[PDB]
Symmetry: C3
Subunit: 284 residues, 3 copies
Amino acid sequence: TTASATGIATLTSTGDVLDVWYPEIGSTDQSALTPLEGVDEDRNVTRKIVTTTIDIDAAPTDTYDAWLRLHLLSHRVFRPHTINLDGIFGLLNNVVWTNFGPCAVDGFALTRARLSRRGQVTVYSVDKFPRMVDYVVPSGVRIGDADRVRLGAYLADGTTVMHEGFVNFNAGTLGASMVEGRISAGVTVDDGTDVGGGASIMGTLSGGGQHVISLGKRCLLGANSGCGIPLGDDCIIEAGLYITAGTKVLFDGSLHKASTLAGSNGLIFRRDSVSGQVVAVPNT
Amino acid sequence: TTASATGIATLTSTGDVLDVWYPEIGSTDQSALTPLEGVDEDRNVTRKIVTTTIDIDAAPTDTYDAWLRLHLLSHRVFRPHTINLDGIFGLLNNVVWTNFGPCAVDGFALTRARLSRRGQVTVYSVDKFPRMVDYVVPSGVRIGDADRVRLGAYLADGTTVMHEGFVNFNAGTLGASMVEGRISAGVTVDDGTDVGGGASIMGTLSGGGQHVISLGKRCLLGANSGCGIPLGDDCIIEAGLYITAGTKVLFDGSLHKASTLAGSNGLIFRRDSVSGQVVAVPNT
Amino acid sequence: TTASATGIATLTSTGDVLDVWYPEIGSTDQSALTPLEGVDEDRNVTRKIVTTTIDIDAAPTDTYDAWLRLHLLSHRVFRPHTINLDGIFGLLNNVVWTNFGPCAVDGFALTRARLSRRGQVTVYSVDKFPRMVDYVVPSGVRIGDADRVRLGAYLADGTTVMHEGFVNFNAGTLGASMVEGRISAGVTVDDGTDVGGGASIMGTLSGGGQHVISLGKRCLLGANSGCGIPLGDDCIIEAGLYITAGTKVLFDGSLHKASTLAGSNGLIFRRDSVSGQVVAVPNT
């Protein structure tokens, strides 16, 4: 699908793209942005209006195109998995995200020294993905510590991300959800889901499919729980319990790999003291 | 109990209250605050001195009264559960907390554009509760990442909140305590307690009482542990173990719901490899 | 070993040292820093160039010496455990880390009021250790939320610290590593290690040796796991499992304290549904 927008890019003297801000999508209005164009000699960058047009099904081909992809997600124009992001890591620069804006990692010590004549320099982050909220604040959301939501995160109207929640790029919520735990890249949860405090969805060593996971509607993951399998609607994972793809769970009298229960609806995963096993039992 | 204070409110052109700062409680001194009064045309708000008087036992009745309640907690004038907070969620506005101060969520894109003529705009948080430290820094405390303590948190002299700790409103510490994990709203811990790294107190799905919990003195919760029951003094929860209200624990030869041990003193909760159970054993 | 550097100190009118910045180590160039020297009457501090020389094997003896020690670590001049830090807690002041720089905890309310005539005051942290990145951005690293890396952290080239990672002082990575969990003071991990999301290394109640731990090369700790024992190379800890020094693990047909396996290479620690035990099995 064709998509396009007008934004303002921050460029180094090499022409490396540190960032592009697209305040809105599909718009032509350049002169909202003209008074931001210019040179910043302390940072050695220039800011320059650009117009970018892409095909969402093609892999991104340069840095401008990568940035527009992430804005399309966080503006909620497109959902996770409807935009091709292949190769995006090779298109984004590592940047020093400061109170004065993006700065190049090369020669930051000189930049810091020059900027310090204007004020205290604070570094928020050093990464290829900036903090979502500094580019897009989507409507109807709360974010308690906005360090923890990357540009490219999709947060549906009605979502709260608590301070210990985290939402990566190409990930997030498809309806109103309470996110107190960690949503890895590619993962989505649906309406009325509560990801409890410190819970992990698709974390390190949770799975071994060639393929990413999601949760359905009204799933409840307990605090400090984890989930490495796709779940359907109305599933519950007990506080403190990590269900990995390879966890053996007792369901109908025998042990089964949790991956065999992928996509189930209405299951409660919990520890069971009488059997000594993780059990999967029907939710009612 | 009657309480009162003089502060400065930030108001939108509708008269919605974005925030009130009360630098001190019970004071009359208006002209410390007069040079802050004014209009900010970029944000479209005005700042205006107010005096607010409340009864701590009555439910709050407007936004000013809500804000004073949260200041009374974080100034440590009153302890958690001695101030009525019923309805507070309906009195607080969702706000965009920026480096230029509070901004309205409605029309933030225009606000961001106007503010950007003065400097880089950074959004810290989008929420109904601001970061405590921007209103009150209570004496004798350390806070490693101050995104993680909400205004309304009560931190006793001698408390350290580590970077992965979190303290909600109406919650916190009643004596000198090390907080490396997460204290939900309504929860308090007492003197010499260590909430270990990533531990959860009263998290999502930890309990099913009609009622909130607390820990006593000198409780030690291991890293990545959890507790969904009130505990007395000198209790220990093993690292990595979540004790929910419904967890079956082996105590005196039989299995009991952990809720039956609510308020105990001197218990160690740990996994036991010879029984395959969570055991509760006497601390000595 | 003798070490020295030129920096700029922030001093209160008592001469208490709030911070020292040493932009580079072993250098004489004072006049890069002269235009920063001065008085800040709102904060009541002065900034003053200093030259500091220490012996890395001697305990630190004043505040300047403490600060240089932490810079030597985060500049990667010396590795964790090659600099004596005994007594450092008594040499560092508790500071209010603000957007205007370090401020004294004593009389902060007056400082906040004075600074507010220049702009919104934001408090980032209140602690004895500042945020590493505001003093040193080491080359070749990404840090998603830079609140979570203390000055004194050693991050090897090629390291990513994700937003829920944390690295204390005198701790970190000895080669390229993915840090998504929490590295306590004194702990190091080596090349190709992945500390999964929310994992804890040497957290509260994980151990009872008189002595700190480390992980070797290519160790994989699952999300929400924990480790309280030194491990060698190529070890794996299952997602959701905490291996404490006192955890009983099944290895060769009998139960052994995990501390007896300290320093092993090529072990996989996982829950085993058929035995009901934590097992340690060979990695291949």
